[PDB]
Design an enzyme around this catalytic site. Structure first.
Site, PDB file in Angstrom:
ATOM      1  N   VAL A  33      10.084  -3.606   7.333  1.00  0.00           N
ATOM      2  CA  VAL A  33      11.089  -4.553   6.931  1.00  0.00           C
ATOM      3  C   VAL A  33      10.424  -5.716   6.232  1.00  0.00           C
ATOM      4  O   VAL A  33       9.453  -6.248   6.770  1.00  0.00           O
ATOM      5  CB  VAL A  33      11.910  -4.991   8.138  1.00  0.00           C
ATOM      6  CG1 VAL A  33      13.000  -5.903   7.625  1.00  0.00           C
ATOM      7  CG2 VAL A  33      12.530  -3.778   8.822  1.00  0.00           C
TER       8      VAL A  33
ATOM      9  N   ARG B 193      11.631   2.814  -5.731  1.00  0.00           N
ATOM     10  CA  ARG B 193      10.887   2.476  -6.940  1.00  0.00           C
ATOM     11  C   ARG B 193      11.855   2.109  -8.054  1.00  0.00           C
ATOM     12  O   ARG B 193      12.947   2.688  -8.062  1.00  0.00           O
ATOM     13  CB  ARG B 193       9.990   3.607  -7.396  1.00  0.00           C
ATOM     14  CG  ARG B 193       8.886   3.908  -6.404  1.00  0.00           C
ATOM     15  CD  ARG B 193       7.907   2.754  -6.249  1.00  0.00           C
ATOM     16  NE  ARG B 193       7.348   2.313  -7.529  1.00  0.00           N
ATOM     17  CZ  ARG B 193       6.136   1.756  -7.658  1.00  0.00           C
ATOM     18  NH1 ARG B 193       5.327   1.564  -6.596  1.00  0.00           N
ATOM     19  NH2 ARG B 193       5.716   1.389  -8.879  1.00  0.00           N
TER      20      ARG B 193
ATOM     21  N   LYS C 121     -16.860   9.309  17.308  1.00  0.00           N
ATOM     22  CA  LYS C 121     -15.590   9.842  16.829  1.00  0.00           C
ATOM     23  C   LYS C 121     -15.870  10.917  15.779  1.00  0.00           C
ATOM     24  O   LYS C 121     -15.256  11.973  15.755  1.00  0.00           O
ATOM     25  CB  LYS C 121     -14.718   8.696  16.349  1.00  0.00           C
ATOM     26  CG  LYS C 121     -14.016   8.031  17.528  1.00  0.00           C
ATOM     27  CD  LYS C 121     -13.976   6.513  17.541  1.00  0.00           C
ATOM     28  CE  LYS C 121     -14.832   5.910  18.652  1.00  0.00           C
ATOM     29  NZ  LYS C 121     -14.311   4.619  19.150  1.00  0.00           N
TER      30      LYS C 121
ATOM     31  N   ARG D  97       2.066  -2.336 -18.252  1.00  0.00           N
ATOM     32  CA  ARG D  97       1.069  -1.289 -18.521  1.00  0.00           C
ATOM     33  C   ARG D  97       1.662   0.095 -18.857  1.00  0.00           C
ATOM     34  O   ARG D  97       0.977   1.084 -18.630  1.00  0.00           O
ATOM     35  CB  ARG D  97       0.109  -1.108 -17.353  1.00  0.00           C
ATOM     36  CG  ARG D  97      -0.744  -2.310 -17.059  1.00  0.00           C
ATOM     37  CD  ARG D  97      -1.529  -2.015 -15.807  1.00  0.00           C
ATOM     38  NE  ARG D  97      -0.702  -1.469 -14.729  1.00  0.00           N
ATOM     39  CZ  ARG D  97      -0.914  -1.737 -13.411  1.00  0.00           C
ATOM     40  NH1 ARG D  97      -1.902  -2.534 -12.954  1.00  0.00           N
ATOM     41  NH2 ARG D  97      -0.099  -1.196 -12.508  1.00  0.00           N
TER      42      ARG D  97
ATOM     43  N   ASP E 255       7.723  -8.436 -11.875  1.00  0.00           N
ATOM     44  CA  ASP E 255       6.789  -9.575 -12.001  1.00  0.00           C
ATOM     45  C   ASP E 255       6.919 -10.553 -13.153  1.00  0.00           C
ATOM     46  O   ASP E 255       6.197 -10.488 -14.108  1.00  0.00           O
ATOM     47  CB  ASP E 255       5.313  -9.151 -11.845  1.00  0.00           C
ATOM     48  CG  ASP E 255       4.719  -9.694 -10.572  1.00  0.00           C
ATOM     49  OD1 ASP E 255       4.598 -10.925 -10.321  1.00  0.00           O
ATOM     50  OD2 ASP E 255       4.472  -8.698  -9.739  1.00  0.00           O
TER      51      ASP E 255
END
Ligand SMILES: Cc1cn([C@H]2C[C@H](O)[C@@H](COP(=O)(O)OP(=O)(O)OP(=O)(O)O)O2)c(=O)[nH]c1=O
Ligand SMILES: [Mn+2]
Ligand code: NA
Ligand code: NA
Length: 327
Positions: A95, A141, A64, A175, A184
């Site tokens: 999904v 986001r 390749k 952060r 989270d």
DNA sequence: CATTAGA
DNA sequence: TCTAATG
């Protein structure tokens, strides 16, 4: 990093289409080690042959390479790029709750589009049903601006319910991250640690709370230690409702918060790196602990950590802010 | 790499 | 139970 890019990049395109589109774990598992090796390689690869000398580099991959070498392209790649069957698989997969396994079955049955997905909302399960539900909202986001709002609220009940609660929203947002995907939430509590045979209502209490107030709109999966859900910021004085976001929360046995907490904060690199270090330093750091190393080859003996500092101190390092956990 | 759904 | 999916 740049010098042997296309090559690795091509290889991953390849592997990806193997593990996903095809059930070819080996071939898939093939392209990767390769894409990994050439990656390591200190020099501009030139011929398949040159590549070839490499472990993992057999003839197939090597082949390749050349074709890609001469013509910055690839037929097999070009073809996979076209094929709707495959094109489709890659998309459905988007999904939340839709894996390959399913992406394919869906495909067969003829679940090619999203609308397909809708018409056959019946062929789907709650996860993937909510996945389909907040398809747009999810791909988006999470602006920090909103991170802070959320953060706040969550913190507030955690306290309200029981004051003995400890909450840490970790991750990127932790952060300094200007953006984020899902929030989270790290959890813990005193009564809960290493031995104390759980207290499931622990997790239970809070979820129940946030649902109460209407933060948490749904459940993706509610376990006796892990919750996975969907949330939302109270749509203000109308005209601007909020996007449905992904939230996760997990109770942690206080005698292993900080490590996790350390860890869940990352970054991916910081951890490895930091983790790599504790090693020279006579340690070992894992998602939950920090154990002293023994010369027999290996050892145990879980050290006591009261904060981010301790873990550091231990492997004797510099306190690094979340902001700087960048690498 | 461990935790949940589901069938 | 196994097997998928998320992380
Ligand atoms: C490791 C990195 C994090 O600690 C953890 C996984 O958290 P993730 O939600 O996978 O991601 P993140 O917080 O690093 O990124 P973002 O918010 O931009 O999506 O495991
Ligand atoms: Mn995240
Ligand atoms: Na070789
Ligand atoms: Na998915």
């Amino acid at each position: 990093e740049t010098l042997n890019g296309g090559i690795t990049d091509m290889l991953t395109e390849l592997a990806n289409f193997e593990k996903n589109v095809s059930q070819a774990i080996h071939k898939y598992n093939a392209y990767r080690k390769a894409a990994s090796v050439i990656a390591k390689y200190p020099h501009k690869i030139k011929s398949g042959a040159e590549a070839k000398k490499l472990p993992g580099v057999g003839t197939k991959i090597a082949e390749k390479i050349d074709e890609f070498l001469a013509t910055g392209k690839l037929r097999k790649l070009e073809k996979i790029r076209q094929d709707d069957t495959s094109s489709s698989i890659n998309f459905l997969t988007r999904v939340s709750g839709i894996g390959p396994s399913a992406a394919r079955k869906f495909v067969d049955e003829g679940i090619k589009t999203l609308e397909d997905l809708r018409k056959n909302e019946d062929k789907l399960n709650h996860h993937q049903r909510i996945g389909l539900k907040y398809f747009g909202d999810f791909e988006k986001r999470i602006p920090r601006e909103e991170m802070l709002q959320m953060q706040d609220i969550v913190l507030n009940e955690v306290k309200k319910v029981d004051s003995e609660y400890i909450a840490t929203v970790c991750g990127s947002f932790r952060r300094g991250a200007e953006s984020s995907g899902d929030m989270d939430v790290l959890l813990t509590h005193p009564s809960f640690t290493s031995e104390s045979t759980k207290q499931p209502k622990l997790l239970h209490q809070v979820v129940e709370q946030l649902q109460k107030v209407h933060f948490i709109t749904d459940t993706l999966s509610k376990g006796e230690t892990k919750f996975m859900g969907v949330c939302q910021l109270p749509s203000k004085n109308d005209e601007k409702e909020y996007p449905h976001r992904r939230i996760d929360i997990r109770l942690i046995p206080k005698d292993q918060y900080y490590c996790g907490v350390l860890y869940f904060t990352g970054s991916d690199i910081f951890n490895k790196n930091m983790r790599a270090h504790a090693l020279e330093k006579g340690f070992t750091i894992n998602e939950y602990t920090i154990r002293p190393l023994g010369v027999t080859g290996v050892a145990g003996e879980p050290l006591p950590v009261d904060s981010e500092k301790d873990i550091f101190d231990y492997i004797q390092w510099k306190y690094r802010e979340p902001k700087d956990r960048s690498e």
